[PDB]
Amino acid sequence: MKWSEYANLAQQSLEKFYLADTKEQFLNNFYPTENPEEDNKVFNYWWLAHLVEVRLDAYLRTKKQADLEVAEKTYLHNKNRNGGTLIHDFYDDMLWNALAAYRLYKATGKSIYLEDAQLVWQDLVDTGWNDIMGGGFAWRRPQMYYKNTPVNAPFIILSCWLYNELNETKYLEWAMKTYEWQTKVLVREDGFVEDGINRLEDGTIDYEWKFTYNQGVYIGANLELYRITKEAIYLDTANKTAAISLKELTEDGIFKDEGNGGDEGLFKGIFYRYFTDLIEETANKTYRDFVLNSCQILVENAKLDGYLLMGMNWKEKPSGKIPYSAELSGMIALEMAAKLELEHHHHH
């Protein structure tokens, strides 16, 4: 089965294992789910933001209107569960949705999605930044002193996208301002990206919170700025972050576990997305093979009744309670493998 076909199977697998009993819920958070009521209490607004993105990946691959519709329907379901707006207490949850909104805008051409993305950017600029810890956007409204990567890196990406779209200087200025702070405060000399700082109001960094998605979004931020500025530092930094990530976060061809919590299940999917952008920008065949080889391990072990149930550890057979966040990273990885399989040419 080709990668494009595995991506299609992955797309179908989500509802196979997560379709909820009611249309209102849409998807159960876990599989299996012995007690739906309790397991579904948490509204994973940010998980759904990434589902919109993976549904869009399928559309970009197929060009089928039906696929774009599933993406839009998903986005509206999420926005409406959140009260008919993208505004949320967690600045990062908002950003993931703003990124999905922009991609939806580019695919549908509907102005409401661009306005949604712009509104999120504006809300962060108007309320999320302060000079505690020297700058940076805060994690959530009730904790304005805690500055972390999940908020700052995605904001840089959103700012760059908005800059290219609207051509207003404020977008590039904020992208640069945020990048400078992010790099100075949360990035290691060798390119490793720390999760955040001052979470406990003690001014320290969570060094042991080594997560793949922090590396991924920093790579994306660098590539977006490289596209706009063309300064070597951005491409060089993207490469260093990618290299250190593979060196310290992987083992035996796959990424090591990052935690049994639900949210962590989505982390490596996010890395794969921006890591794939680096691959296309640099034509790095070693990194290209890492993606394809890791996906091979996933498919050789995630089979379940003809479909794919993809947990946190890609080498192990599907076991225990699995959040669809993990399912999403598997789906993202396969869509990336499928894209790589098309051998798109970007540079000679």
UniProtKB/TrEMBL annotation:
Q: Which GO terms describe its biological process?
A: carbohydrate metabolic process
**Which InterPro entries did the record assign?**
6-hairpin_glycosidase_sf (IPR008928), Glyco_hydro_76 (IPR005198), MUG_Protein (IPR053169), O_gly_hydro (IPR014512)
Q: Where is coiled-coil annotated?
A: none
Query: What is the protein name given in its UniProt record?
Result: Lin0763 protein
